[PDB]
Design a protein around this ligand. Structure first.
Ligand SMILES: *C/C=C1/C(=C/C2=NC(=C\c3[nH]c(/C=C4/NC(=O)C(C=C)=C4C)c(C)c3CCC(=O)O)/C(CCC(=O)O)=C2C)NC(=O)[C@H]1C
Ligand SMILES: *C/C=C1/C(=C/C2=NC(=C\c3[nH]c(/C=C4/NC(=O)C(C=C)=C4C)c(C)c3CCC(=O)O)/C(CCC(=O)O)=C2C)NC(=O)[C@H]1C
Ligand SMILES: [Cl-]
Ligand SMILES: [Cl-]
Ligand SMILES: [Cl-]
Ligand SMILES: [Cl-]
Ligand SMILES: [Cl-]
Ligand SMILES: [Cl-]
Lengths: 487, 487
């Protein structure tokens, strides 16, 4: 049994069922004997009785089994349009995992490289992350013909954000919406990292059992790399509630991590033939590589811009006698270095604020706290009320703070602020739009997913990125440097 | 007992002795009672009998003890020119570690900020790592008056390289010389990371014991943060063999790691007064911060240069019909992206070489190996013979290899090579120069240190840096990208 209490630990890699758009035969390491098979093997391949215990060559034929052996470390081999003993044509997916050979058969519907080259040429010239992700949903929708294409980007806390959308006009928008980390369990994230493609042909389809589900040793069949692997009844119910019959996800791998997903949703059943899936997988790899380079370039540009800005400031600092007056006149210009909603200067026990900052009365408390925990280093939090409980009252204005010491001797600081994340939301969805529910209740709806995320990030700001902290550290050295020169 | 067999595990943090240029009093957490004292406390402070068991105020006076309490998390407090009960003036170092208060006294010889500001102003304008490290040894020698100033940079394997030197003309040069990781044990590296300064006043001086060495509980006195802490007899013998009487080291901390040391050596005994040491410590902090920023800038410049070069190549690739001919004509130009001694192109089972590469006959073996382990990713080693034993024969020409796949489909590679590190040595030292030895033998001489390092890096090249691998990965995506466009 699986429910909302234990679905976070569901063993989705060993479901004991496949989807009905293909059939599955499990053989031993050397593909000599047939150990397991899907119940629908009889109907599709045209066989009678139990296949378990019979030889590989006896079931498929000496001709086919020889080709399968030649094809055989963990990445599945795609063999489109293969012929059986009785002439029937099938698309075959072959892989070996935990010293078990798994063979998947699809009714053949026969140019992967041709489709992929067209798609990859149209994204290769993109000169920004924004331009790449914007055109991709549009392009994938037009080429693959799904009713909705989304891109999810994973936050530091595992939450997903919808950062791009192409949809049918009549469908509701999820653009700028967040879902909590729990909506995609750890075991699901692990499989998304191992398989480029994940296909759900028909959410309402009857799943086909694998026989036997457990062998005599008490071992289930690991379907981690099987494209026919059946899906969790929790996710099934989620899709049914949304009016989604079919899905296909493409994993976005950046710097060997799961950056996010390209997800295609359809309102009617839909499976792509093996050749179209090979093309989509190749597009996924190229999209991932191009995004990785564009991310690297944006980081370089951001830090080069910060260096240029700090050099401009050091030049002015050499021509001003009173450094303190220059900081009072200039501090707001440091807002261009690090994305923030407000910035402040704490110098000679005097406060100067710009944009969204805590109230004037709250600053001395904040300054004393920073002085005690900083230890002459950059100090940052995205959850100010977890550090100072009475900061809760002004969380709408300033929920996050990054502190930069600007003196090696005195307790003078340059303070950067961010509003709580819900204040910066740009959501294009319909709040009136409601969803039909199943046995499990309204937990499995976009509406409730978004409400749970909003609760989890209350009194919290957008976290300070690795790039934000790198620029802050370079700014500390620059300002502490000139402050020493002027002593 | 300590010898060459167990000096790697010597507990140098609990030696039970101090250096004779000061005296030490250990008190309880609250500085109420005197628990331990150095044998020379009587002579310097002018007291008689045992100090252990007597109250803090009884030994020092109600006046002094009140000031010490006010000064008191792990970073020692420097109190220059403090007066005792009987009028005597002392420089006092105060710290609290493992709930024990340690108080160190130096005969007072009384402007830290004034000296430091002069030194820091002369390094702040340096525009390259090379310019900073070159001027620093020269500057430190002239200001602090030591016979030799070295800068050591630590390699990935813990080995030290002499990257800058200012010395008396009559002394032998260590510039471009390496020492093995073992020459500075792990416990020594840990203390270098905790203390900015390490002082050895007189290598031939008689060490003063701390009484008691062990308390009744069986606990020794942890002198981790004590400037008077005595030095290992292994290092003592090393300095004596070199003709060095005194040393002072400044720790270089970059990105919270021990980057290296600024080491001052003197041929006669030498201790700097507390005010000069405060100035040297501040110079150390600023040198470390400026080096950190210059390292960051050089990395940015290197990767920006690689992007510019790859963009130039992509422009040419759009105007050439045959991409393979462009690679055959251009491959040597990729040597400008990544520091290497040679580069090669393996395309359509044909080899083209430039600079120091393996022999023509050895390449097919190498290409087959790369094809099997690469898995369509960047593969690199600095020790080629550990992967292919018969690569040993051509290690003088090519000991290191970095492989870049240039096709998603075919097994075509762009190969970068480095000679074994001893071929690239630029050593300014005297090979005829010999050293007197002590009981332990010739192991404790620069001559034998360098010989042991040379043996440890046989058949090995300069390791591929994080920046080298980052550029290689960006080059892979660029070349695999255009190769797909031309299919
Ligand atoms: C307690 C377990 C739960 C759970 C498990 C699974 N989710 C899986 C896939 C999945 N879930 C979501 C979440 C969404 N939140 C939205 O607001 C929304 C639509 C706007 C969606 C779709 C996503 C995004 C995904 C990924 C696929 C997709 O986007 O279509 C999953 C794996 C499915 C598989 O086998 O391929 C499991 C298991 N989902 C829950 O909601 C909870 C409670
Ligand atoms: C088995 C233990 C050994 C050992 C221990 C210690 N070395 C310490 C300091 C030290 N050792 C060296 C090495 C050098 N190699 C050279 O070729 C060379 C001169 C050209 C030197 C000086 C260095 C560089 C250092 C750092 C200080 C300095 O450079 O002067 C040490 C700590 C000393 C302390 O208490 O401050 C320990 C312990 N040294 C060995 O050689 C071995 C065998
Ligand atoms: Cl954003
Ligand atoms: Cl502006
Ligand atoms: Cl205000
Ligand atoms: Cl170098
Ligand atoms: Cl050139
Ligand atoms: Cl040759």
């Amino acid at each position: 049994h699986v429910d909302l209490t234990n679905c976070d630990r569901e063993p989705i890699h060993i479901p004991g069922y496949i989807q009905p758009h293909g059939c599955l035969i499990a053989c031993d390491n050397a593909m000599r004997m047939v150990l397991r098979h899907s119940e629908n093997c009889g109907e599709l391949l045209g066989l009678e009785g139990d296949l378990n215990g019979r030889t590989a060559e006896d079931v498929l034929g000496k001709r086919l089994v020889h080709d399968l052996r030649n094809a055989l470390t963990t990445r599945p081999a795609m063999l489109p349009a293969m012929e059986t003993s009785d002439g029937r044509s099938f698309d075959i997916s072959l892989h070996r995992y935990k010293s078990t050979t798994i063979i998947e058969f699809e009714p053949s519907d026969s140019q992967p490289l041709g489709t992929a080259r067209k798609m990859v040429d149209r994204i290769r010239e993109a000169d920004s992350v924004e331009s790449l992700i914007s055109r991709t949903t549009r392009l994938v929708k037009a080429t693959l013909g799904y009713d909705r294409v989304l891109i999810y980007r994973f936050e530091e806390d595992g939450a997903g954000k919808v950062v791009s959308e192409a949809k049918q006009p009549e469908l509701e928008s999820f653009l700028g919406q967040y879902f909590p980390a729990s909506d995609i369990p750890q075991q699901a994230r692990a499989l998304y990292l191992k398989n480029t493609l994940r296909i759900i042909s028909d959410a309402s389809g009857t799943p086909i059992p694998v026989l036997p589900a457990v062998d005599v040793s008490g071992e289930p069949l690991d379907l981690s790399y099987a494209h026919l692997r059946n899906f969790s009844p929790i996710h099934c119910e989620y899709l049914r509630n949304m009016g989604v019959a079919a899905s296909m996800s493409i994993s976005v791998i950046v710097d060997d991590a799961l950056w996010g997903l390209i997800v295609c949703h359809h309102c009617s059943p839909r499976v792509l033939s093996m050749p179209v899936r090979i093309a989509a997988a190749m597009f996924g790899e190229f999209f991932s590589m191009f995004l990785q380079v564009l991310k690297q370039k944006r980081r370089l540009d951001t830090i080069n811009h910060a260096h240029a800005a700090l050099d401009r400031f050091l030049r002015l600092a050499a021509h001003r006698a009173n450094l303190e007056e220059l900081l009072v006149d200039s501090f707001q210009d440091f807002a261009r270095l690090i994305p923030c909603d407000g910035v402040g200067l704490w110098v000679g026990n005097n406060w100067h604020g710009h944009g969204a900052t805590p109230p004037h009365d709250a600053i001395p408390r904040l300054a004393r706290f920073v002085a005690s925990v900083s230890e002459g280093r950059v100090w940052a939090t995205h959850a100010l009320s977890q550090a100072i409980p009475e900061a809760e009252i002004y969380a709408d204005t300033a929920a996050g703070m990054l502190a930069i010491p600007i003196s090696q001797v005195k307790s003078d600081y340059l303070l950067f602020f961010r509003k709580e994340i819900v204040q910066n939301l740009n959501w294009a969805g319909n709040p009136e739009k409601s969803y039909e529910t199943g046995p499990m209740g309204d937990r499995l709806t976009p509406r409730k997913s978004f409400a749970i995320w909003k609760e989890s990030v209350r009194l919290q700001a957008q976290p300070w990125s690795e790039a934000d902290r790198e620029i802050a550290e370079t700014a500390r050295i620059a300002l502490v440097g000139v402050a020493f020169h002027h002593s």
